[PDB]
Symmetry: C3
Subunit: 125 residues, 3 copies
């Protein structure tokens, strides 16, 4: 029942919270390449948008007392599956040792027409 | 371990159950705006369909001994991302004290051509 | 947390793993109809591809110490919702004593243009 909020992640504008903790698990909301500072989309390419998504996720992971290496499951929504290789190159840089389980599919459309949205489930250390 | 069975949500037709509990977590099946009384799609708008999905989810939550305020994470599958404004206004009415984490994406198509499908993970107190 | 490695399922060559265990929950990566041996697509029809997915999922379940009857939640990604009826006819044969919670949507595109992808969460007894 613990709710996660941090200003270095985009503010939850809508009927949701950035993340919620139950027991040893963190359930984070899907993060899109939004700037927590400005409030608009960061990047016109899949590489630039993926990097901002990772910053948003890392901010939420930090605020909950965990890190990328302790993420358990990641779902990666792509607006175009042909971006996978370019996305995967930036996605791997968030992790040092351990890698989580992953699912990557192409959806019809993402909020604000972004190219990438990642939702994570992480273990609380 | 324990399966959820209630006549106040649409009947689980086929190889799935309305919900399953492990530990203190409820994993509810994705709910579509089906009427548990008639089996027909309720509503032709995103507002009317979302209201039926909330009723269906609420029945599963109640059968599991929890409520909307103890949902940890929700995933909302929409057929049209442009329904976001109207969807969020109805979706928010399900809650009394707190909002869960959430992801919302546009899929290509939903079962029975509905506009919304919501799956929830909830904490059992 | 432990990591699943099995030759009986397609190898996780990249920044991801076949599955990750936290507590009594197994979070498996989304599985596609890939041959663990040849690495090619197995099956031309939804029935044939689904059977290869079930084999891949079963391998991860067996490596984790669980089975289909202890899968808690399944999310099914279809490239065409019209295949959902045929999909369920093969999907049901994987379970004997209990059915898991399920969500199913039609996405815009799946990895390698497959027809079905299934991500499961299972309980480690």
């Amino acid at each position: 029942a613990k709710t996660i909020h941090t200003d270095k992640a985009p503010a939850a504008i809508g009927p949701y919270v950035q993340g919620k903790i139950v027991g040893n698990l963190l359930f984070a909301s899907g993060q899109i390449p939004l700037s927590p500072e400005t409030g608009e989309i960061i990047g016109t390419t899949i590489e630039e948008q993926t990097q901002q998504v990772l910053k948003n996720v890392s901010a939420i992971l930090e605020a909950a007392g965990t890190d990328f290496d302790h993420v358990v499951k990641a779902t990666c929504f792509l607006s175009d599956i042909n971006d996978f290789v370019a996305f995967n190159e930036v996605y791997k840089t968030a992790f040092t040792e351990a890698f989580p389980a992953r699912s990557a599919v192409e959806v019809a459309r993402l909020p604000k027409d972004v190219k990438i949205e990642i939702e994570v489930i992480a273990e609380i250390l």
